[PDB]
Design a binder for this molecule. Structure first.
Ligand SMILES: CCCCCCCCCCCCCCCCCC(=O)OC[C@H](COP(=O)([O-])OCC(O)COP(=O)([O-])OC[C@@H](COC(=O)CCCCCCCCCCCCCCCCC)OC(=O)CCCCCCCCCCCCCCCCC)OC(=O)CCCCCCCCCCCCCCCCC
Ligand SMILES: CCCCCCCCCCCCCCCCCC(=O)OC[C@H](COP(=O)([O-])OCC(O)COP(=O)([O-])OC[C@@H](COC(=O)CCCCCCCCCCCCCCCCC)OC(=O)CCCCCCCCCCCCCCCCC)OC(=O)CCCCCCCCCCCCCCCCC
Ligand SMILES: CCCCCCCC/C=C\CCCCCCCC(=O)OC[C@H](COP(=O)(O)OCCN)OC(=O)CCCCCCC/C=C\CCCCCCCC
Ligand SMILES: CCCCCCCC/C=C\CCCCCCCC(=O)OC[C@H](COP(=O)(O)OCCN)OC(=O)CCCCCCC/C=C\CCCCCCCC
Ligand SMILES: [Ca+2]
Ligand SMILES: [Ca+2]
Ligand SMILES: [Ca+2]
Ligand SMILES: [Ca+2]
Ligand SMILES: [Ca+2]
Lengths: 246, 245, 245, 245, 245, 245, 246
């Protein structure tokens, strides 16, 4: 009967977010971040030696690729006969390097290409990339498994000896375009010898070929100085001992 | 700047054990403050309400005056003294001419007793429920701060500069995380316990306050205004015929 | 500090399986207490409200005195007994002089029935809603405590210090984490189940209490004070007219 | 305990795809229940409120008896039938003497129509808003349980023995958690949609209920008691003057 | 299930950068909707309330009839027309017979103006404050969905088969984590900004609504019923004395 | 997309130390705004309430006119002035002829003092509690945002090209996580400090406002309308008897 | 003033809990645990790969060392002039391996030791270590840095060819001692290499020497049929190419 019309009531005051839940979300996010970053740091620490070795391997690959590309660019510029396989470090003279049956010489193009490529490879090896990663050059010999074994071995050995003669025989056209230091460098960077058997090609005429396969230091080799030897200055011109007239 | 690095060197220099100890100590102090200022106070309020209900349920058959002085002498507490004074102002005493004098024959209630012995005046304000209902969030926040600070200490200690130091660094960081989680776990356990006790105390206090006000409401009857209006209407209707007669 | 290290070795010494077991057992105890003190109690309240509503509808077309006696005999549980006493105080009985005696010809309402059969007194206080609406939060927090304490155990065991025994440390960490998450998932499941049950029950209680108070409100008509004022105004006008005549 | 290991191997033996499908099916059934019992119900309520408001606005200029009869015929839904009955109890009909008869010349309001066509009675109880406002939390909890269950399945099957076993176990754990999070993300999206739909529907229900009660309030003028008191005061002064005259 | 496997394989193959773009687009759309539907409307409401308050304060010292006409003109071409009509119904005009004409000499308030110009019907319903208090949570849910999905994608792609693959796996994982963190940072920033803006605007709205309804209450005085009752009592006593004389 | 990468480069371009500095400075600015706009105002309000309570308790034993003048001069703040005007016009002054002029002999309370000096009017609106109760969540959210932003900067600038680049990037990531921990710790610390200060201030404000309104409530007595009706009924009966005599 | 003091109260619907920060916190709890598990699992796995690679390399080295040790012990048991160096995987001849000017054949002791070492190499390759790691054997020629370079190369290459013949000549005791399978295995193992000029200490007696070295599979090397060249069964006897009057 005598109620107060002016009695007021509090509004619909919705409460705030409970601070615990947002703080807990903050803490859980911080913990998730901590575990992520600790995993990243730990994995980067355990494998840092592996990472450094892989980086060095990639750098060696880049240097070798650059040197091979420079050498093959020089070959393309100078002589079309010289084709370079940078994938597996092979110098090929396919058409000019064919060997007929039971002979160890080559046509004129074989010698032209060989005596043309030797100075180019010497120049490549004399560069800083060569002075850091280039070892001596291996002459590749190939023989088939048919017939008498030792006849094929003797044929390949005579082919290698003929290649080395042609590189370092008197009156050769290369000898007229060479200096003493370059001749010494050829003597140091080249060894003649090596035989192999393979069945990766469809024709037996392919095995009758010669190739240049340069090989490089490993990452942990790093040009052991004690391995290098020395030769005296040339006192008399070299003479090939294979039977040229045959 | 260098200011941030300097302070980070300053904060993360303390031993990892000092952080859970600080969290535990501060959370325990806040829990003790809760027990003292809130739980014991709420228990005292509940027992006071029970005692007051017993006395009111005891004068239910006394004369209206005797009831009135008994209730006046019963309520001796600032909030309840004021509430009783206002409630007594709300009561309408009816006088009838007996023995040549005006004597109280009946006391009528014009407002419910809960309008004066309300929850805010008797429970919420004495218990500071506007503050203590947010204490568990404060406790959990203290624990989270302790955990964060321990995590900074642990992360500052973590530095595996060698592949052979990775396992030791990871184990030490997990130990520091263990310390920080100890602080957080204690704080959250205390917050849950505080929430349980605080909500239970509110429920009990509200139930017993309802019983108290129901006891007070039962002493007096309402509807005096409608009775007065009915009497006035009857008097006017009779007065017309009185004038005519 | 020796104290804090002793605390850690005491906490982490418990077998990890006791953590999810403790969480599940205590959360199940909380659920059982919820069922006993809230759910079954609310079911009883709802059934009582429905039965009382049925009883009130049976006296729609009875005499006001018969209705009053039936309602007085109907309400006997303590809180509804008090609510009915207060409501009957609110009702205004209109008397007329018939056959030389005063008889109740009509009983008028002055306040809504919900003013005394309130949601608070009849639902919220008997069900302890001031506590139980916070129970799901307590359960979720208990699961969170189990989560921290289980990961603390797991981080404590993780200390291999040898490449051979790293597998065992990882296995133990996975087992402890599995225990912690089992406890947390059970606690969250129980919290949402409690939320479902309590909110559905409280909605049904409010719905049927509304029906009960609507049944009570239909017995008695309101607006009697305005009718008394209108009678007084008409009486004054006719009084002036009768005076002049 | 062997019981804990047995229940763990039982729980984690379910296929990881059965967690997202269970969460999605349960959340979708809860969503369908929400749509049927709240969204469609509230849409029907709003349509009915608009139609009733249009009907009430068409009897603004009618006579009090005619518009009273129209409103009595209009309100037939049980909740609005009771609400209209109580509101019409609250209306005070004023009679005057024309042709030696008592007929209604003006109907006055004593309480606002929102007191009887209240938000509770007409919206909250029909829509079970006391329950359906907690549904987004339940959906979120179900999604969280699904994610935790998937994580537990992934963790139980982890084998850190060999590096290949470690990698396969990590893949399986991530796959199981990805399934579970598919279910959980569905649950959170449904929670967002339910929140939006519920809040929009309740806001529009309150808006058109306010419009309906506003249409009902415009028919009847309040403030009749003060006018009656002023009339009584004027009559008293006139009675004194007329007595002397 | 084949469909679940297809869904999983298509969800694993999503580009990691698309998830943050989706989060940003959806959160920006929600923010634009917030600005259009809440912030601009709240600014308009506040400006209109200030304009109304200035209009009301310009008739503090005007005649009551002029005041009523000014207020009716002010609120008649508005959505507050019915609220003003009800408020003016609650106003009691006191009349005195001056120069043979009944003129309004004073206007008395019988109810506060806040009961007609309520917060719900002037601020809450127009602004959809029921929904927009949940929008920060909606944005948080979008953020957690995007973040968890992106981190799952990142962990699925992270699998170092050999120690030489650790570096690339770490780099790609960090990129994916960066995308997930971008999404979450945007979503949580928008959540906090929405919270700040809409809380500040709702505080301003409540403040200016209070200034408006206080300007309305300052015009007219209350307590006219007690004055009428006092006049009636004095008139009754004087009438007894007058009858005797 | 190009847009996403451009956004990432633009956002990440800032120095890593500027994120903790930004978080600390923004949180400190929010704290200073809280101190200036909430804490100092609340302290001023509490001091004013205590002074007003002392002044009201001093004026208890004075004449009603002197009390009215003193209370009118006392309340000068705009909200206090409006509240006092409303309360005073709710007060009923009883005039008696002593002996040739109208003199105020008693002033009666027809409404509680808290109806006008309410918490909403005097504490909640001046303190802008509708905004400041959500500030701690904003502070914690800014901590989270700083964490995400700092990690974005760390992740985007990760350089895996070279092993010492990897080492520097990992060191930057660790520093960024330490920075994020520091910012989160500071944000949560300021949030809980704001919560403590705010809730303590609001509780003390409610306590002292209750004491103040109790001081006002003690000055005047209620139940004047029932006394007037009782006087009218007694006068009617005595007028019948006097007419017969 | 006309209202009723006994009015409805508690008209306050409880606000629902905000659920989304709860979801954020719990999903970051799951994500944090996932990141911790991935951290420990990834660290353990990467460390296990690293230690597995290290111990595999160590086991391969140990197998190589055991093969060299048992081969050297067998060499001592057979005849004492054999010099085996496990530090560089080389079997040399102490004094019997010397050569004079214009000489291309080992002395009687040299031929006897060369014939004796072959079955030891066959047994070494036969054993599990040989199957696991043993590559083909190359023959390296050494000669002083003085004299004509082509003369030295031809002489050393002739020495290598004579050694290969003595390995596979029908008149040699090996052919009448070994079987067809042993002959095929020798064909697979023994290869001719290059010519080296490691001249030191000014000792021509020990500089002009020939020794055999064995190579081994690497840890990452693959065994496949492409590299396994299979010689056809011997259909005719082999006569050497350098005749005695040379
Ligand atoms: C070990 C495993 C853990 C298991 C679970 C935890 C412990 C058990 C939970 C206790 C509840 C069950 C007790 C029921 C038995 C009988 C009671 C009975 O019949 O009436 C019940 C009562 C019936 O009320 P009613 O029918 O309306 O009234 C008529 C009755 O006759 C009632 O009226 P009355 O005439 O009988 O009057 C008696 C009244 C008298 O009341 C008064 O006069 C005033 C009461 C003031 C309330 C203040 C609370 C008590 C203060 C004690 C402080 C102790 C500190 C605790 C620890 C601190 C340091 C560690 O006393 C009470 O009934 C008080 C309420 C009972 C709860 C308090 C328990 C005390 C025992 C301590 C347990 C120790 C374990 C602690 C574990 C945590 C730490 C290790 O029920 C209710 O009121 C409804 C609420 C029921 C509560 C359910 C609890 C939910 C489960 C929560 C689980 C854990 C919470 C998380 C926090 C832990 C930290 C993380
Ligand atoms: C770039 C896009 C990329 C993002 C896409 C996703 C977006 C996420 C954002 C999250 C939420 C932010 C929204 C903030 C603004 C809304 C606030 C509000 O209340 O607005 C006020 C306003 C109404 O209040 P008012 O300001 O007074 O307006 C005047 C009235 O119209 C007239 O006055 P009246 O009161 O007298 O009117 C009578 C009243 C009473 O009538 C009634 O009976 C209404 C009561 C119940 C309502 C029943 C409606 C059911 C509709 C079913 C679903 C439709 C679309 C759902 C979209 C999600 C699915 C992916 O009628 C209404 O109020 C009905 C209007 C409500 C329907 C709105 C139109 C439908 C969609 C909008 C089309 C535009 C396309 C935008 C993008 C679409 C999204 C992809 O509502 C709107 O117009 C809102 C529309 C804005 C876009 C809403 C987007 C839907 C959000 C759902 C969450 C998505 C979760 C994903 C689901 C996946 C599950 C597995
Ligand atoms: C009542 C607090 C409310 C909530 C509390 C929650 C925080 C929980 C945390 C933490 C533990 C604090 C560490 C102990 C405090 C100082 C005691 C002490 O004397 O320490 C000594 C040590 C000196 O050692 P030295 O002599 O130099 O050499 C020792 C080498 N072994 O002192 C210190 O290092 C100072 C420690 C800093 C105290 C500040 C604590 C702040 C805590 C939380 C807030 C977040 C910080 C954010 C800062 C941002 C700045 C812009
Ligand atoms: C409204 C959402 C609120 C907040 C959500 C936060 C982020 C959650 C979402 C989403 C994924 C990102 C959206 C990508 C849309 C691009 C569509 C398009 O332009 O192309 C059409 C596409 C062709 O492209 P692909 O062949 O798939 O390219 C593969 C390259 N690797 O073909 C199609 O028809 C559509 C294919 C849909 C792909 C994305 C599916 C996402 C669906 C729902 C997302 C729900 C949350 C994620 C939970 C994952 C738990 C397992
Ligand atoms: Ca009573
Ligand atoms: Ca009725
Ligand atoms: Ca009206
Ligand atoms: Ca006023
Ligand atoms: Ca008083």
């Amino acid at each position: 009967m005598f109620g107060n019309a002016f009695g007021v009531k509090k509004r619909r005051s919705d409460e705030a977010e409970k601070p615990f839940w947002i703080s807990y979300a903050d803490l859980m996010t911080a913990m998730m971040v901590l575990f992520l970053v600790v995993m990243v740091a730990s994995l980067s620490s355990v494998t840092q030696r592996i990472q450094r070795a892989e980086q060095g391997e990639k750098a060696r690959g880049q240097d070798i690729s650059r040197l091979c590309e420079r050498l093959e660019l020089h070959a393309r510029n100078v002589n079309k006969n010289i084709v370079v396989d940078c994938h597996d470090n092979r110098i090929s003279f396919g058409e000019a390097g064919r060997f007929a049956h039971n002979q160890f010489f080559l046509n004129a193009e074989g010698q032209k290409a060989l005596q043309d490529v030797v100075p180019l490879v010497l120049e490549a090896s004399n560069s800083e990339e060569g002075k850091k990663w280039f070892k001596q050059i291996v002459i590749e010999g190939f023989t088939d498994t048919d017939g008498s074994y030792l006849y094929n071995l003797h044929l390949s050995l005579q082919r290698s000896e003929w290649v080395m003669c042609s590189l370092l025989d008197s009156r050769s056209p290369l000898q007229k375009n060479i200096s003493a230091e370059q001749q010494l460098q050829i003597r140091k960077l080249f060894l003649a010898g090596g035989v192999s058997f393979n069945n990766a090609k469809e024709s037996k005429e392919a095995s009758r070929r010669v190739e240049l396969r340069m090989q490089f230091f490993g990452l942990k080799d790093k040009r052991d100085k004690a391995d290098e030897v020395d030769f005296p200055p040339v006192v008399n011109k070299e003479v090939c001992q294979l039977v040229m007239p045959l | 700047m260098s200011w941030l690095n300097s302070i980070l060197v300053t904060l993360t220099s303390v031993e990892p054990y000092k952080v859970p100890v600080t969290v535990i100590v501060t959370v325990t102090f806040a829990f003790v403050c809760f027990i003292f200022f809130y739980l014991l106070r709420s228990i005292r309020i509940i027992y006071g309400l029970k005692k007051y209900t017993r006395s009111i349920n005891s004068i239910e058959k006394s004369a209206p005056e005797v009831q009135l002085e008994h209730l006046k002498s019963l309520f001796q507490r600032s909030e309840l003294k004021h509430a009783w004074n206002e409630f007594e102002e709300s009561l309408h005493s009816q006088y009838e001419l007996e023995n040549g004098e005006e004597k109280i024959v009946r006391i009528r209630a014009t407002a419910p007793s809960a309008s004066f012995f309300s929850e805010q005046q008797l429970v919420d304000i004495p218990l500071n429920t506007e503050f203590f209902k947010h204490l568990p969030g404060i406790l959990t926040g203290m624990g989270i701060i302790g955990t964060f600070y321990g995590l900074m200490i642990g992360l500052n200690h973590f530095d595996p500069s060698t592949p052979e130091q990775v396992s030791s660094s990871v184990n030490n960081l997990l130990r520091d995380v263990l310390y920080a989680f100890l602080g957080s776990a204690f704080a959250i356990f205390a917050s849950i316990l505080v929430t349980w006790l605080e909500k239970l105390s509110i429920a009990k206090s509200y139930k017993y306050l309802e019983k108290f006000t129901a006891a007070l409401d039962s002493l007096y009857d309402s509807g005096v205004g409608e009775e007065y209006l009915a009497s006035l209407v009857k008097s006017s209707n009779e007065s017309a015929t009185q004038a005519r007669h």
